[PDB]
Amino acid sequence: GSFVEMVDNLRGKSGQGYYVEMTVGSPPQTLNILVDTGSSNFAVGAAPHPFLHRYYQRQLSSTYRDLRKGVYVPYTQGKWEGELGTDLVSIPHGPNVTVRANIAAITESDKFFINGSNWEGILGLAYAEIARPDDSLEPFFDSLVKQTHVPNLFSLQLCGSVGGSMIIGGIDHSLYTGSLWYTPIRREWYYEVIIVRVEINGQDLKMDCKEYNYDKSIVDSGTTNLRLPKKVFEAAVKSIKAASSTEFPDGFWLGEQLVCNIFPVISLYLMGEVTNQSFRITILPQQYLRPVDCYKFAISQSSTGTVMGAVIMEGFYVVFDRARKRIGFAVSACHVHDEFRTAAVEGPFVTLDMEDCGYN
Numbered sequence: 001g002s003f004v005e006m007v008d009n010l011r012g013k014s015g016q017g018y019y020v021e022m023t024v025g026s027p028p029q030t031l032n033i034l035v036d037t038g039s040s041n042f043a044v045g046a047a048p049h050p051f052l053h054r055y056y057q058r059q060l061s062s063t064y065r066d067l068r069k070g071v072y073v074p075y076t077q078g079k080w081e082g083e084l085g086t087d088l089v090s091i092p093h094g095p096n097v098t099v100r101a102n103i104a105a106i107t108e109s110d111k112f113f114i115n116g117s118n119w120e121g122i123l124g125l126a127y128a129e130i131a132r133p134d135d136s137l138e139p140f141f142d143s144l145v146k147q148t149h150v151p152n153l154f155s156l157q158l159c160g161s162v163g164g165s166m167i168i169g170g171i172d173h174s175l176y177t178g179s180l181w182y183t184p185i186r187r188e189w190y191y192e193v194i195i196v197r198v199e200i201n202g203q204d205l206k207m208d209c210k211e212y213n214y215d216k217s218i219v220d221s222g223t224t225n226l227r228l229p230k231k232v233f234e235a236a237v238k239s240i241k242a243a244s245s246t247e248f249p250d251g252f253w254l255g256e257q258l259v260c261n262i263f264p265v266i267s268l269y270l271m272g273e274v275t276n277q278s279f280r281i282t283i284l285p286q287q288y289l290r291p292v293d294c295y296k297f298a299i300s301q302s303s304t305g306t307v308m309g310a311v312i313m314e315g316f317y318v319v320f321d322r323a324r325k326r327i328g329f330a331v332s333a334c335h336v337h338d339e340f341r342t343a344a345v346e347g348p349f350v351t352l353d354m355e356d357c358g359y360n
């Protein structure tokens, strides 16, 4: 319940993700590694791309083993491609273990590394089902749990240069206030959850909740914003527009221009652990209005579903309880609040037909 060694082990810059220090090979080579709950490959810079501070030098590692296979990863607006192998991996500000993990040595990329960023690789923390090239390539966390006695969970306190904590194998009670509330992981592929109701300021959207999860709702540290299906984003914006009648152009709502409280709180009710029981997590404009005093509207549309990104996660201590296929949310001890409104996790609530909120 206390892991001081791991507190404050995350750094980053706004909009460029949160990274943890890791070492790969023998002797250990230090890299900064982006923490990504929305993918499942451990992949690292292995060549002197000009944006890279450093990169994995396989020729220096006695423990490197070639898998003699490639892997090609296109994503929304970019790509990476690499060469698979395994090597010894540790986390200096994490548990005192060393694991043999799969590593993709990145040898070609496009719009993947960021000019001016301070990380050199990515740690995919989601499940094997979305691993590349297929589900046979064991994700890092699976390897860590299989080879050591680290419990099958991790938790994230994303604070917002930004800071935070990744507690590997446990929960640190100093990182949150009040109680953790858990929502089931619906399917172990992404960290998929079911949103059951949406309020802005207090007002239900009265949408068929099946929409809120079309075709997915995921928890993703690798995304900055809260991302909504269009049909849901359309209605969501509509009410935030009306909630904010006192004062902005139409492009601002599409995040096509920047804007330099009158803003409503956003509540998502998540499926609870018990039949007909839910809970709600409440966030602020502080969360969906991120400084770029110009701010970007941090809610946007998706064809792949709801994405609960740093906009949501920075409100809360988030527990990825893999052992029990559930994700816990508590008010984060670091979240940024004013004197009037603070982020909230409240339950229980009575919500019927929560099964119908998910898409098959």
Ligand SMILES: Cn1c(N)nc([C@H]2C[C@H]2c2ccccc2)cc1=O
Pocket (backbone or CB within 6 Å): 017, 034, 036, 037, 038, 039, 075, 076, 112, 122, 220, 221, 222, 223
């Ligand atoms: C939202 N998202 C997430 N979570 N992961 C990826 C994986 C491609 C790798 C990635 C992570 C972070 C930044 C850029 C690329 C793509 C991506 O678009």
